[PDB]
Design a protein around this nucleic acid. Structure first.
Length: 223
DNA sequence: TGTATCTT
DNA sequence: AAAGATACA
């Protein structure tokens, strides 16, 4: 048992020996020596530990991990108990309350419940320097997360990609827009949420698409 | 003070 | 590249 889930490792391990990945891992190691980097090393790949890769139905793609202490744990927007949901997650919960009739605030911020249902909770960049949003961009993570999206694009059908923010949306070009369903809106951070996230109705729309394709919907209350 | 996006 | 301007606690 290790950092990568077995099915994810099987289909992404071809990246490990590539120069960009070696330089990426080297960069993160050096950063960890001189700064506080989030999430902890053992939690960078938590997004591979929640379901088999073939059972992914929905992809939520954000920018990068939470950059405050004890927040980021390898699932986009998620915080483990007893950590309070950050402003971004409270905004996600606010949208869910208007979008999903039966949804009420769960009283915690752990999104493992969604991930287990086949919702990939990915960020475009997978580490961050404390207190500095997007500080680890353009270092190799983009190419790696491109490999994640590209594998899913090729080996699946009728996926729902939810691309939240400019940086997540860079991956839109790698997705077959007829074969899969790309929904795009502003990042749920208070700095950007007012630019379309509120009222985007991504959660109900996702389930509409899934049910149309004959797939089981996500129970957004199941956390 | 703290939580993106556009523009240059 | 990287920095300045731009809802609500």
């Amino acid at each position: 048992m290790e950092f990568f889930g077995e099915s994810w490792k099987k289909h992404l391990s071809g990246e490990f020996g590539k120069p960009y990945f070696i330089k990426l891992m080297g960069f993160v190691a050096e950063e960890r020596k001189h700064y506080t980097v989030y999430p902890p090393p053992h939690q960078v790949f938590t997004w591979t530990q929640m379901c088999d890769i073939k059972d992914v139905k929905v992809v939520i793609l954000g920018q990068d991990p939470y950059h405050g202490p004890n927040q980021a744990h390898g699932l986009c927007f998620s915080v483990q108990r007893p950590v309070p949901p950050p402003p971004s997650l409270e905004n996600i919960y606010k949208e869910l309350s208007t979008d999903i009739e039966d949804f009420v605030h769960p009283g915690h911020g752990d999104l493992s419940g969604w991930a287990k249902q086949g919702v990939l909770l990915l960020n475009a960049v997978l580490t961050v320097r404390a207190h500095q949003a997007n500080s680890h961009k353009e270092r190799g993570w983009e190419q790696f997360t491109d490999a994640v999206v590209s594998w899913l694009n090729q080996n699946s059908n009728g996926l729902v990609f939810l691309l939240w923010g400019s940086y997540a949306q860079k991956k839109g070009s790698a997705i077959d827009r007829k074969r899969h369903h790309v929904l795009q809106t502003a990042h749920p951070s208070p700095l950007s949420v007012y630019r379309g996230f509120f009222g985007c109705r991504h959660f109900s729309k996702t389930n509409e698409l899934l049910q149309k394709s004959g797939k089981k919907p996500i129970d957004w209350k199941e956390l």
